[PDB]
């Protein structure tokens, strides 16, 4: 398997790991802060997904310093992972077009 496909797969697995770890850590960081809502694991996982995809509905979000640092890691991991898939798709099209041109 070519590099871009392997890297894409790896990025997906790493993203799932970041989502799970981020969910666990977000609850750890937010409980103890009066008013915080990102405090149970099921909704924290949902929050991690809508954060990684950059949707950000606003139904849930961190209010503490550490919860926000966790959020930044989730954001960057999501953007980087989806960006890498785009890059892999571009490489695929580039390779195919070269062929179609006889190269």
């Amino acid at each position: 398997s070519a590099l871009h496909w392997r890297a894409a797969g790896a990025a997906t697995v790493l993203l799932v790991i970041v989502l799970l770890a981020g969910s666990y850590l977000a609850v750890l960081a937010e409980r103890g802060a009066p008013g915080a809502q990102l405090i149970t694991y099921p909704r924290a996982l949902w929050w991690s997904v809508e954060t990684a995809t950059t949707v950000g509905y606003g139904d849930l979000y961190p209010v503490t310093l550490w919860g926000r640092c966790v959020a930044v890691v989730v954001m960057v991991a999501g953007i980087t992972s989806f960006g890498l898939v785009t890059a892999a798709l571009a490489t695929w099209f580039v390779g195919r077009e070269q062929e179609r041109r006889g190269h």
Partner: antibody
């Protein structure tokens, strides 16, 4: 089988401290939190604090004077609540309860009756 | 912190009659409300979770409803064993808080 085991009672002289225990059995997850609740005779339930054994962090009710310090021993699956410098105001039943990180207390211990008297 | 108001503090019903306990939150908490039963000298016992979800082992007689700020715990056809104190508890925001409790009294 009993998921949370707590000693029946503890007599404490005013000013002294005591360490309550809560031995847990059954399924255990990294997402479990052990809570402590205080209930004076004839009164309601008051949340004291919580601790996550897998990490060891504890949080406390800010609305009340802090009398407790929570710890947990992973190898013995036991959670502890150290109550210090007690007065008769601290006399009550202290329950421990388990929450699977999803907001509700799935199960409660039988409670430890603490009496502060000379 | 979220204040949970349970009023009336005492509810008197006749045998076999349907009863409803009230729980009002100081602010909207979605369906993050749970109900517990505590008999004399007993420890609290979970009856309903997330406002209306059944717990295995609890009689079908028990049900819950509501969302937002107003919640209800209902018992269809009350019987002696239901005599106890009932508490609501929220988990929408930190810290978790408890309502002050409602006692069920039966007029036989």
């Amino acid at each position: 089988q009993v998921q949370l085991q707590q000693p029946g009672a503890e007599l404490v002289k005013p000013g002294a401290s005591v360490k309550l225990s809560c031995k847990a059995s059954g399924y255990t997850f990294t997402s479990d939190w052990i809570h402590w609740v205080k209930q004076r005779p004839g009164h309601g339930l008051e949340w004291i604090g919580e601790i996550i054994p897998s990490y060891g962090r504890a949080n406390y009710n800010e609305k009340i004077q802090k009398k407790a310090t929570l710890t947990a021993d992973k190898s013995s699956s036991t959670a502890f609540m150290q109550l210090s410098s007690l007065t008769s105001e601290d006399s009550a039943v202290y329950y421990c309860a388990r929450e699977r990180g999803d907001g509700y207390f799935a199960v409660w211990g039988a409670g430890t009756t603490v009496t502060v008297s000379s | 912190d979220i204040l949970l108001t349970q009023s009336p503090a005492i509810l008197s019903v006749s045998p076999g009659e349907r009863v409803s306990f009230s729980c009002r939150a100081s602010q909207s908490i979605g369906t993050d409300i749970h109900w517990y039963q505590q008999r004399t000298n007993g420890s609290p016992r979970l009856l309903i979770k997330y406002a209306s979800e059944s717990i295995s082992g609890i009689p079908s007689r028990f049900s819950g409803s509501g969302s937002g700020t107003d919640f209800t715990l209902s018992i269809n056809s009350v019987e002696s064993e239901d005599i106890a104190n009932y508490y609501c508890q929220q988990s929408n925001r930190w810290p978790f808080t408890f309502g002050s409790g409602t006692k069920l009294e039966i007029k036989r």
